[PDB]
């Protein structure tokens, strides 16, 4: 019996922490304990525990590579460069970067989810452009093991999380992703696809800049299934 544990937390009506864990009955309390402890400070927290009906185990198989640069301009060019290796018009890849660096949310600032960009046109396919689409119901099959492995290999807790998220995106039919954090002090971002793997790029933004985001490069003809997979398919990723 598998359970999805989803936590969100707020201070003063602004989102401050979030996570999901998908575990067996025997590890259910451990997981709740982790997520309860997760935010340093909050005034409202919600935890949601849901029994999993169908799910699928998938084997992780992306090559990881890191790349460093003098400035964000150089970083963002390499991002575009690498995206074209997935068959994306340079104009489209450039459009994603522009969107992210300007603030993906039309109101201003950060979306809570991702832009769904049409690979051919560059058009924003998502209906709510403030909220975007959120990739949920996924986790490492054995997170203890993955976490110790990836940390002493050099990578960070963000990497651990971002790896699992993207892998699900790519599995769900997303052709490629552009992403960088919105935390103003973490300036390593990435670009990923089945061909290029997971490609870490520092620095993808200036230090102290609080804007970040995700763009999923999707084929329009597949939009529905992709949105369905992203939001609903339960996926456990195995190393
Ligand atoms: N589950 C998800 N699905 C799709 N996009 C997401 C996402 N979580 C975050 N994003 C996008 O990625 C950008 C950066 O978020 P991150 O820095 O990776 C995690 P976070 O901002 O700390 O939220 P968290 O507190 O839930 O972890 C956000 O601006 C948002 O656009
Ligand atoms: O792989 C890394 O080390 C960079 C993590 C990607 C940053 C994404 C995020 O934190 O939102
Ligand atoms: Mg953050």
Curated annotation (Swiss-Prot):
Catalysed conversion reaction: heptanedioate + ATP + CoA = 6-carboxyhexanoyl-CoA + AMP + diphosphate
Cofactor requirements of the protein: Mg(2+)
EC numbers, comma separated: 6.2.1.14
InterPro entries: BioW
Annotated GO biological process: biotin biosynthetic process
Pfam families according to UniProt: BioW (PF03744)
Swiss-Prot/TrEMBL keywords: ATP-binding, Biotin biosynthesis, Ligase, Magnesium, Nucleotide-binding
GO molecular function, one term: magnesium ion binding
Pathway: Metabolic intermediate metabolism; pimeloyl-CoA biosynthesis; pimeloyl-CoA from pimelate: step 1/1
Coiled coil: none
Family label: Belongs to the BioW family.
Summary of the function given for this chain in its UniProt record: Catalyzes the transformation of pimelate into pimeloyl-CoA with concomitant hydrolysis of ATP to AMP.
Subunit structure, as described in the record: Homodimer.
Name of the featured protein: 6-carboxyhexanoate--CoA ligase
Organism the protein comes from: Aquifex aeolicus (strain VF5)
